[PDB]
Ligand binder design. Structure first.
Ligand SMILES: CC1=C(CCC(=O)O)c2cc3nc(cc4[nH]c(cc5[nH]c(cc1n2)c(C)c5CCC(=O)O)c(CCC(=O)O)c4C)C(CCC(=O)O)=C3C
Ligand SMILES: [Cl-]
Ligand SMILES: [Fe+2]
Length: 307
């Protein structure tokens, strides 16, 4: 009945895909052999390829089932629309149209909104809808305010923090982060940095960890300022000022274990904590955990109810 357009970045299915994938990320402008080798190396450092493709499938169809098992007002049919590899956003909308789906709710697998992320997802999805003639795309822009989302993260952080000696929890700090973007989005009151601060604040309101700070990660290869501080620079800064013994990294901008977590956090950030002599913690990402599917099920239903 109702189309469930679940959108995410996408990831190379094969080592042979890294090239066209990176090209699509660079809006067609093919990267150099050096850029490709750096990216391929990062993928190999996390075991070869990312599990994002399978986690994304599990989230998309785990969400479809969660919605369908919880009510019978409508039947949701989930179509996956990736940003930089097939099936693309336009392919998903094409499938919805050919399948007779005339109404759909779209959600990005990223809780926060920004001109670079969700807006691009929604523009492409809605423009594909306009051209094909359907379906009608009712887009969710953000859902970080979903109480179950905040609680999910607080629980994970609390699960980890209660593994920290009480006499060292005062020396523990929570690093909330998301994918960095060009700092210029802050010049036009882009909500992204604020949604992250709000998310960090909400989660801090509900965890035992007494210290927290908002960082950014995965800044791109460009020649303009990107949002900071970077989680690595932040870790250094915080150890210098407070000598924290435990760093709990929650890249709440992401919803799955993928390259931007398995490398930029589990490697690059751990390198810094190893350096300063502090402990590294990175709670499990939501992936397709039942409570996260419940978060998405709640977000999508509240959206449908408001249609
Ligand atoms: C806001 C945002 C999200 C969060 C929202 C969302 O989920 O959409 C996100 C997620 C992801 N980004 C990812 C991967 C990459 N992003 C890149 C590059 C870039 N991302 C950007 C932005 C974002 N990205 C930007 C503005 C660039 C620079 C483009 C340019 O300079 O032209 C590059 C190129 C190399 C590099 O710059 O590091 C890669 C490989 C993966 C998949 C990881 C895997 O494969 O497991 C995921 C989930
Ligand atoms: Cl992008
Ligand atoms: Fe990206």
């Amino acid at each position: 009945k109702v189309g469930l357009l679940v959108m995410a970045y996408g990831t190379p299915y094969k080592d042979e895909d890294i090239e066209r994938y990176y090209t699509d990320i660079r809006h067609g402008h093919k990267p150099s052999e050096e850029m490709i080798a750096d990216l391929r190396g990062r993928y190999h450092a996390i075991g070869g390829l990312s599990p994002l493709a399978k986690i994304t499938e599990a989230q998309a169809y785990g969400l479809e089932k969660a919605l369908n098992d919880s009510q019978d007002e409508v039947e949701f049919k989930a179509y996956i629309g990736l940003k930089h590899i097939e099936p693309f956003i336009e392919d998903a909308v094409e499938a919805m149209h050919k399948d007779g789906i005339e109404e759909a709710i779209s959600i990005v697998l990223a809780p926060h909104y920004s001109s670079f992320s969700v807006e691009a997802y929604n523009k492409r999805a809605k423009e594909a809808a306009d051209k094909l003639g359907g379906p009608r795309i009712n887009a969710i822009n953000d859902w970080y305010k979903q109480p179950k989302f905040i609680q999910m993260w607080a629980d994970r952080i609390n699960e980890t923090a209660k593994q920290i000696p009480a006499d060292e929890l005062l020396d523990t700090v929570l690093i909330v982060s998301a994918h960095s973007l060009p700092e210029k989005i802050k010049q036009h009151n882009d909500p992204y940095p604020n949604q992250l601060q709000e998310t960090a604040d909400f989660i801090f309101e509900k965890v035992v960890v007494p210290h927290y700070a908002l960082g950014w990660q995965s800044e791109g290869k460009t020649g303009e300022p990107w949002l900071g501080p970077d989680v690595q620079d932040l870790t250094r800064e915080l150890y210098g000022r407070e000598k924290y013994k435990h760093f709990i990294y929650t890249p709440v901008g992401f919803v799955a274990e993928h390259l931007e977590v398995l490398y930029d956090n589990d490697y690059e950030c751990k390198v810094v904590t190893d350096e300063v002599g502090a402990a590294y913690h990175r709670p499990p990402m939501p992936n397709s955990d039942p409570e996260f599917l419940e978060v998405l099920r709640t977000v999508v239903w509240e959206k449908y109810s408001n249609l």
